Amino acid sequence: MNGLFAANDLIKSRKVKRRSDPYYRKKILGTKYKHSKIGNGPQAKGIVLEKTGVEAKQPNSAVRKIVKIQLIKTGKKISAFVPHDGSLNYIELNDEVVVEGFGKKGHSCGDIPGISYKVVKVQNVSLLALFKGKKEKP
Amino acid sequence: QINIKKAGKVKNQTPKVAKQEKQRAKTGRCANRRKYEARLEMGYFECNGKMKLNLK
RNA sequence: ACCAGGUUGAUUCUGCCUGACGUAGACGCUAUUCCCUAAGAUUAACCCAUGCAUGUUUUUGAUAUGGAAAAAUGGACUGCUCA
RNA sequence: UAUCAGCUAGUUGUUAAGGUAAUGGCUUAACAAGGCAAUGACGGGUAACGGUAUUACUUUGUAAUAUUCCGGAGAAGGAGCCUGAGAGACGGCUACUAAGUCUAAGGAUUGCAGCAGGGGCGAAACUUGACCUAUGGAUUUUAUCUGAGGCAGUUAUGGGAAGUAAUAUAUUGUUUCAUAUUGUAAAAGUAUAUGAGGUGAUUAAUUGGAGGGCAAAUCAAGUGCCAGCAGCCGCGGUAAUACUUGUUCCAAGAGUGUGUAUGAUGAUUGAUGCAGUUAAAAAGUCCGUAGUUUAUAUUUAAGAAGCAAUAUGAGGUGUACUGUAUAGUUGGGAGAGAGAUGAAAUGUGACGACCCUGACUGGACGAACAGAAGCGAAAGCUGUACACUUGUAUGUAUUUUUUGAACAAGGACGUAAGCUGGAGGAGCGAAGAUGAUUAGAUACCAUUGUAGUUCCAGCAGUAAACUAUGCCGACGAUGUGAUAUGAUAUUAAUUGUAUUAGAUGAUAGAAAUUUGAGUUUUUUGGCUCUGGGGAUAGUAUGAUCGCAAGAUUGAAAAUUAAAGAAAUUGACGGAAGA
RNA sequence: UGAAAACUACUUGAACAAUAUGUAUUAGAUCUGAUAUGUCGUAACAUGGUUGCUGUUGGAGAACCAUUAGCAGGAUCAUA
RNA sequence: AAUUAGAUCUGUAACUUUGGGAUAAAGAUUGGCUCUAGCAUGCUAGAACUUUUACUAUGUAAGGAAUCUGACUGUUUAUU
RNA sequence: CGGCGGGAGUACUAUGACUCUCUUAAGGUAGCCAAAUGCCUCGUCAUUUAAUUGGUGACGCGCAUGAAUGGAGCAACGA
Ligand SMILES: [Mg+2]
Ligand SMILES: [Mg+2]
Ligand SMILES: [Mg+2]
Ligand SMILES: [Mg+2]
Ligand SMILES: [Mg+2]
Ligand SMILES: [Mg+2]
Ligand SMILES: [Mg+2]
Ligand SMILES: [Mg+2]
Ligand SMILES: [Mg+2]
Ligand SMILES: [Mg+2]
Ligand SMILES: [Mg+2]
Ligand SMILES: [Mg+2]
Ligand SMILES: [Mg+2]
Ligand SMILES: [Mg+2]
Ligand SMILES: [Mg+2]
Ligand SMILES: [Mg+2]
Ligand SMILES: [Mg+2]
Ligand SMILES: [Mg+2]
Ligand SMILES: [Mg+2]
Ligand SMILES: [Mg+2]
Ligand SMILES: [Mg+2]
Ligand SMILES: [Mg+2]
Ligand SMILES: [Mg+2]
Ligand SMILES: [Mg+2]
Ligand SMILES: [Mg+2]
Ligand SMILES: [Mg+2]
Ligand SMILES: [Mg+2]
Ligand SMILES: [Mg+2]
Ligand SMILES: [Mg+2]
Ligand SMILES: [Mg+2]
Ligand SMILES: [Mg+2]
Ligand SMILES: [Mg+2]
Ligand SMILES: [Mg+2]
Ligand SMILES: [Mg+2]
Ligand SMILES: [Mg+2]
Ligand SMILES: [Mg+2]
Ligand SMILES: [Mg+2]
Ligand SMILES: [Mg+2]
Questions:
Q1: Among A49, A137, B1, B34, which is least packed, fewest CB within 10 Å?
Q2: CA neighbours closer than 13 Å in the CB half-sphere of residue B43
Q3: What are phi and psi of B37, to 5 degrees?
Q4: Three-class SS of residue A68?
Q5: Cβ–Cβ < 8 Å for A125, A132
Q6: Looking at residue B55, what DSSP letter applies?
């Protein structure tokens, strides 16, 4: 298809080959509006229901502490990972949390299986500061 | 049959020693001045950075 | 006008993941000045308490020495939002 | 966007009239059959207001642009109209639908996508403040109005000019304090000057990190696969520079990090500019329309047609004959085992096998010659004689004059099984049933046994259908061969054209290998088809084919740091030789 | 037409019902595949103990067996 | 017992043994008088006027969605 | 013409792919169901209704279903 007067056959052929790009295919179908887990935003809110732990994959061995919540914007149930040592003792049930993502394009990183979200705020108190000990929990 | 009772075992167990107050650290171009004269005396520019700075 | 780490007892390739760097929104911690510049667009073009944003003019002169009405002239511009 | 290929009936045109400020199927009579499409009509989706001033990144240009300015549309949703130079107007009127509010119960009434402000929604966004100072509008705008428009308050939205010390404990003297003038619609604030007091451990610096990428500690104390850290690789088993605390060091600095989109890194979208034998990738093979493209000194090569040698060829189709062997019927002779396995067993024979003989009937197939030899578009093609029919190549003063290459739509052929109908059935033989081996065998071994494999008439369309190498065109190193045929030459040779086998060098390649897989980062002669990390998966769903089995087209949600190609060193073999 | 109130006929036409259809989204008894984490065998890799592998047609707890055609990516580039 | 029913014009689904389902379902029109227009000369289209509005004296299908069983046309206990 | 069994252990509970065992001619395969075929029985779940021993769709250790004594199946047709 190399010719001087072949612009009509060149554009029609190169649009077909571009559809096999795995990043461009999701842009056409619009999957980020259809199958989004959290919506379209940086954070979210929720209500805690359980305080349970999971076990990491081989070859490491530990117990990772998580929490099963229910979102407000959509209404679905989801699990999030408590990201610091000794931080679950602040958390009580029937409370509110704020959820932030991991930063690996919608996948799970580390040896934590099937979980892609982590807690950042409890009762409008920063959990990063509360581990440092600057504030106190009401 | 999963235990969550051992949450926060290590950090509450290690004993706390207090901080030691330090002089007020200089800030600004004088902070860059104290760092430049300290590097020039040990020949840090001549050996092309091949030494240990934090020595303890 | 620049690339690095990861498949093997060791080697050379194809191939992808990750690090380093921009542009718009939200968030954590900490803040002494001065000048410039911005602030309910993203979901709900969803519902509104209260107060205020369009009147001028001897053209005649209200049993009235300067204002009643009637006439004349503009309210179709300007401002707000993106269904 | 083809998992949207046909669509349109006031729709296309002619004549005539009405209506408008005006052209016009803009509306209405009569007549006619037109109008648009693979250069994508007609449909479906948008988390779609169009340009522009302005930002990035760049070797011919891409991406963002609610934000400054120009243009278009709407005032809860729809429709209709008055006044008027200009409204299908909403801080103008009428009706219906969805929401309401006041009442003495007869009735009356409201549109904050105008400025403040409240409610809901959310991860997410400010004073129910003063004023006509400057720029403007309202038919002369020096005094009327102006929530248009200015002037101030709240906020880490960003960009600038700067601070937190300097000279050697001491000296001098920047901010945190106040006051005049200038200024303001009136008040701030900025600038110029002036006052006091005495401090840089001060009123005056934080955020992240210290195994590699990646600048900086094998520093100390606790805990022992626990608690925990880590974008990827990876640390934690009583001496951890890789978790918790404490000391010290590094990077940026009035800022510093965490996170969701979206660009660059990317020569992993390749026009410049990727790859298609073996890593993902050339439809099973030909014919042929739209689109793409072309040898020319404008008159001629090539192409197509046609002769000679009736050269050469398991090319195809149909009638007539023929070859031994296996199996069966039968006439003679004779009288115990025949047949198979590593070794045996069931089965089989005195109603006489097995062997040597004499005659017959049927079905399948052409041994040895038989090759790195021939023909065919591919799948394929070996007994003889005739009939019909067909290729490529070599020679040559034969006709015509550019008729060419490759191909979306369409068409034909296509081993082996498998289907419906009729013919036939010697050997072989899935399924089924028995005898041994075995812990177990429904498998390998052996004995039986049906469909099938044979012929005619049709459907069906899949293979490791492989040279795993699409088709056309120009140039290339020697040596030994093979098929056809012409010239020189003559019994002794060396030479022309078209195919084809192999060896040694030379190039190219990641390498094995290699006359193309060469003429390439010093990348371009023309044209069709296919691939973008593994797995889910050639799986679901829709459409088109088929008597059926099934065939072509062909995703996603949830997952995962590898999967893979060529080649060296070991180890192993119920592998082979010396 | 009518003194007017009003009656009659065309035009634009909001709203309310009955059905046909197009685009999204979502409950459901039962219940198919797939991914992430002990029991019974030994299909594949050496001639993996019956050499492997594609295509079709039948069997079966399970990998998988068996008839027929093909390929070397084989255990042979090779002996009148 | 009641509703539907004749004739003309539009329109017609799931399923399928590809013939059917189907006259599916669902809508609209119908008198009298005076004319115009075709050619086949007794049939069919259109127009104007008018009314206590038109197949209906007699004759004339209620419709749709599912399950069990028999393939269909046919025959049989003269008198339960 | 006819016929087509029973008991024991074995992978937090639970179940038994797998194994052992009495006999016999062979031990109901492909299919189908509380059906005109299911005693207990007005079986269990869903749906139809204000309310259902009725109707329809799923489940199966089926008193006593099952292959020309034919099994599975509804397009056309039915006082
Ligand atoms: Mg990141
Ligand atoms: Mg809005
Ligand atoms: Mg007045
Ligand atoms: Mg919008
Ligand atoms: Mg929009
Ligand atoms: Mg007309
Ligand atoms: Mg724009
Ligand atoms: Mg509103
Ligand atoms: Mg307006
Ligand atoms: Mg308007
Ligand atoms: Mg209006
Ligand atoms: Mg308003
Ligand atoms: Mg407002
Ligand atoms: Mg904000
Ligand atoms: Mg620190
Ligand atoms: Mg270093
Ligand atoms: Mg990190
Ligand atoms: Mg680190
Ligand atoms: Mg590539
Ligand atoms: Mg391979
Ligand atoms: Mg391959
Ligand atoms: Mg022969
Ligand atoms: Mg030849
Ligand atoms: Mg094309
Ligand atoms: Mg084709
Ligand atoms: Mg055919
Ligand atoms: Mg194929
Ligand atoms: Mg192929
Ligand atoms: Mg080929
Ligand atoms: Mg094996
Ligand atoms: Mg084997
Ligand atoms: Mg091999
Ligand atoms: Mg009439
Ligand atoms: Mg009958
Ligand atoms: Mg009787
Ligand atoms: Mg059964
Ligand atoms: Mg039945
Ligand atoms: Mg019931």
A1: B1
A2: 4
A3: -70, -25
A4: strand
A5: no
A6: -
Which residues in chain B have Cβ-Cβ distances shorter than 8 Å to A52? 2, 4
Q: What is the DSSP string of A5-64?
A: T-HHHHHHHHHHHGGG-HHHHHHHHTHHHHS-SS-SSS-EEEEEEEEEEEEPPSS---EE
The experimental technique behind this entry is: cryo-EM
A58 touches strand E (CB under 7 A): yes
CA-CA distance, A109 to A100, in Å (whole number)? 14
**Would you tell me how many other CB atoms lie within 10 Å of the CB of residue A69?**
24
- Is A65 in the B-facing interface, judged by CB distances under 8 Å? yes
First CA to last CA across chain B, in angstroms? 48
**What six digits make up the tokens of B47?**
């050996």
Residue A133 Cα, ligand 8 centroid: separation in angstroms? 48
Q: Which residues of A42-52 are buried (b: 16+ CB within 10 A; e: fewer)?
A: eebebebeebe
Confirm if A50 and A82 have CB atoms less than 8 A apart: no
